[PDB]
């Protein structure tokens, strides 16, 4: 009983514009037809404008069904699916709540591969970025088993002010980066952005009260490159927050494979209650990468938004556990959690880094494997295994309760653990060499012996 998009005129040849047919299918499903189920037979469905998902609709695409992004409009977004209306810039409308939407199967060709000059998207010369989904003010949205290809310096998915969103068993292949782009713009392009709902981060609607995203889970998915464009810059995260935005919360990133990202597998500021668990982060050498960042990378990077005037709600309750890191690039850091500047007024707290396995065989590593900078309270770094590199764990300028218990180190060339504090002008240890533990007793710190050493 699922309605076929062919029932409404979709040709599926990649030449005819099938947008209207697809929209009519969705609209009918939203009314109740076919139980809200829409089906996509094998084929290539070109769309020259945005398709709008509606409440209680469920799209299923054949394995050989491909949605081709043909949205090439000046001063206009090039995102295939949205959960709210959009016409032209300057005519945005408020997006009302939507819910119970599912999308499964097939491929979405965001069509962002570069022209031979590498200055623009070859098939969409007028766009500034391309993506697949713009999910805003939505509830209970499920995206699964979808292959996303060639984003033109954009977000494959944006989840803003949305609750109960699941991205599962999908593949994010390739992100095109043109010659002309600056680093500032580049690192702000996460393939899956999870953010509060503001016009700044979600210019597709008028909603501007900073509604948070909540209960978002990205799991069992693969992130890498395609045969047309290089590795993604940042797989998941966000890069913006203000006193007026509510922090996305209960964000779970589980069992994903981040295959050689250029900057980070996970990077964010302004999240609360995050769980990054059982993921695999691989990083190859510059020579085997299409995209490479000279400035370096940090596979997991929970940082603080640059702001010295406001007391922001910086990252809190972040758990980084049981992840595996295979690093070959000497400029790549495995894990980083920080309040980047002593000038930031907010606080980073309740940080847990446990049972992670770091395999660093890069030559002459240029930085620590695990960096914890200015955590204000409740920091736990325990039972992590680090194979290779220079420094193992660096804890700098952290306050409050700190617990570092039974981590393992093998074949390291530098200090296993560095517990550092600074004064208004310089640096000195809080209290050191080899493997040991740190505990907080009555507000005070103390090194404790543990007999776990490398005998390789």
Measured CA to CA, the distance from residue 315 to residue 299 in angstroms comes to: 17
Q: Candidates 46-54, 196-204, 244-252, 403-411 — which segment interacts with Ca ion by CB under 5 A?
A: 244-252
Is residue 321 within the footprint of Ca ion (CB under 5 A)? no
Residue nearest to Mn ion (CB): 201
Is residue 78 within the footprint of Mn ion (CB under 5 A)? no
Q: Candidates 95-103, 106-114, 212-220, 275-283 — which segment interacts with Ca ion by CB under 5 A?
A: 275-283
Report the nearest approach of Ca ion to the CB of residue 248 (Å).
11
**Quick check: 159 and 216 in contact, CB under 8 A?**
yes
Q: Which residue lies nearer to Mn ion by CB, 229 or 349? A: 229
Is residue 151 within the footprint of Ca ion (CB under 5 A)? no
b or e along 361-371 (b: 16 or more beta carbons within 10 Å of the residue's beta carbon)? Answer: ebeebebbbbb
Measured CA to CA, the distance from residue 418 to residue 398 in angstroms comes to: 12
Is residue 275 within the footprint of Ca ion (CB under 5 A)? yes
Using CB under 5 A, pick the residue from 70, 77, 230, 270 that binds Mn ion.
230
Q: Which residue lies nearer to Ca ion by CB, 254 or 405? A: 254
Q: Candidates 64-72, 156-164, 211-219, 327-335 — which segment interacts with Mn ion by CB under 5 A?
A: 156-164
Measured CA to CA, the distance from residue 87 to residue 363 in angstroms comes to: 52
Using CB under 5 A, pick the residue from 23, 250, 272, 304 that binds Ca ion.
250
Q: Which residue lies nearer to Ca ion by CB, 275 or 321? A: 275
Question: For the residues of 211-280, what is the DSSP string, one character each?
Answer: BPPEEEEEES-EEE--SSS---SEEEE-----TTSPPPEEEEEES-EEES-SSEEEEESS-EEEEEES-E
Partner from Ca ion, Mn ion, none binding residue 250, C-beta < 5-8 Å depending on class: Ca ion
Is residue 158 within the footprint of Mn ion (CB under 5 A)? yes
Q: Which residue lies nearer to Ca ion by CB, 101 or 274? A: 274
Of residues 162 through 221, those in contact with Mn ion by CB under 5 A are 176, 193, 201
| Measured CA distances, 359 to 166, 275, 280, 413 (Å) | 30, 21, 11, 14
Q: Which residue lies nearer to Ca ion by CB, 73 or 275? A: 275
Partner from Ca ion, Mn ion, none binding residue 229, C-beta < 5-8 Å depending on class: Mn ion
Q: Which residue lies nearer to Ca ion by CB, 188 or 255? A: 255
Using CB under 5 A, pick the residue from 229, 256, 260, 356 that binds Mn ion.
229
Is residue 154 within the footprint of Mn ion (CB under 5 A)? no
Partner from Ca ion, Mn ion, none binding residue 275, C-beta < 5-8 Å depending on class: Ca ion
Report the nearest approach of Ca ion to the CB of residue 252 (Å).
5
E strand spans, 75-124: 78-82, 98-104, 107-109
Give the three-class secondary structure for 89.
coil
**Quick check: 179 and 118 in contact, CB under 8 A?**
yes
Is residue 447 within the footprint of Ca ion (CB under 5 A)? no
After which residues do gaps appear in the chain, with C to N over 2.5 Å? 431
Helices (H), 16-63: 19-30
Residue nearest to Ca ion (CB): 275
Report the nearest approach of Mn ion to the CB of residue 208 (Å).
13
Helices (H), 57-123: none
Of residues 72 through 111, those in contact with Ca ion by CB under 5 A are none
Measured CA to CA, the distance from residue 145 to residue 65 in angstroms comes to: 12
Number of alpha carbons in the 13 Å side-chain half-sphere of residue 418 = 21
Residue numbers of the site for Mn ion (CB under 5 A)? 87, 158, 176, 193, 201, 229-230
Binding residues for Ca ion, rule: CB under 5 A, are 250, 252, 273, 275
């Amino acid at each position: 009983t699922a309605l076929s998009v062919k029932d409404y005129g979709a040709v599926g040849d990649g030449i005819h514009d099938d947008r209207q047919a697809i929209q009519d299918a969705i609209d009918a499903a939203a009314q109740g037809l076919g139980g809200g189920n829409v089906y996509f037979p094998e084929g290539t469905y070109l769309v020259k404008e945005i398709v709008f998902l509606k409440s209680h609709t469920h799209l299923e695409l054949n394995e050989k069904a491909t949605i081709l992004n043909g949205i090439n409009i000046k001063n206009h977004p090039s995102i295939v699916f949205m959960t709210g209306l959009f016409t032209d810039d300057g005519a945005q409308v408020e997006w009302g709540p939507t819910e119970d939407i599912s999308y499964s199967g097939g491929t979405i060709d965001m069509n962002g591969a570069l022209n031979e000059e590498g200055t623009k998207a070859k098939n969409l010369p007028l766009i500034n970025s391309s993506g697949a989904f713009a999910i805003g003010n939505s509830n209970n949205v499920t995206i699964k088993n979808v292959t996303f290809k060639d984003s033109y310096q954009g977000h494959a998915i944006q989840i803003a002010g949305s609750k109960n969103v699941l991205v599962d068993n999908s593949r994010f292949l390739g992100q095109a980066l043109p010659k002309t782009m600056k680093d500032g713009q580049i690192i702000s392009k996460e393939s899956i952005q999870i953010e509060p709902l503001t016009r700044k981060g979600f210019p597709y609607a008028l909603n501007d009260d900073g509604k948070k995203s909540e209960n978002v889970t990205i799991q069992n998915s693969y992130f890498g490159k395609s045969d047309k464009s290089g590795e993604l810059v940042t797989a998941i995260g966000t890069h913006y927050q203000t006193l007026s935005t509510q922090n996305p919360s209960n964000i779970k990133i589980l069992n994903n494979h981040f295959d050689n990202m250029m900057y980070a597998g996970v990077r964010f500021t302004g999240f609360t209650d995050v769980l990054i668990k059982g993921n695999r982060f691989d990083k190859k050498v510059k020579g085997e990468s299409v995209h490479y960042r000279e400035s370096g990378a940090a596979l997991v990077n929970a940082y603080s938004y640059k702001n010295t005037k406001d007391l922001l709600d910086l990252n809190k309750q972040v758990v980084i556990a049981e992840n595996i890191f295979n690093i070959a690039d000497p400029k790549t850091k495995a894990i980083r959690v920080a309040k980047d500047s002593a000038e930031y007024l907010g606080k980073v707290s309740d940080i847990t880094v446990t049972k992670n396995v770091i395999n660093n065989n890069s030559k002459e590593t240029e930085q620590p494997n695990i960096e914890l900078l200015r955590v204000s309270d409740n920091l736990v770094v325990s039972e992590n295994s680090i194979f290779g590199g220079k420094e193992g764990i660096v804890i700098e300028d952290s306050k409050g309760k700190i617990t570092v218990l039974n981590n393992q180190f093998y074949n390291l060339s530098g200090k296993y653990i560095s517990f550092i504090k600074s004064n208004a002008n310089g640096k000195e240890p809080v209290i050191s060499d080899g493997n040991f533990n740190i505990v907080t007793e009555n507000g005070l710190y103390k090194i404790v012996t543990n007999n776990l050493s490398d005998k390789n």
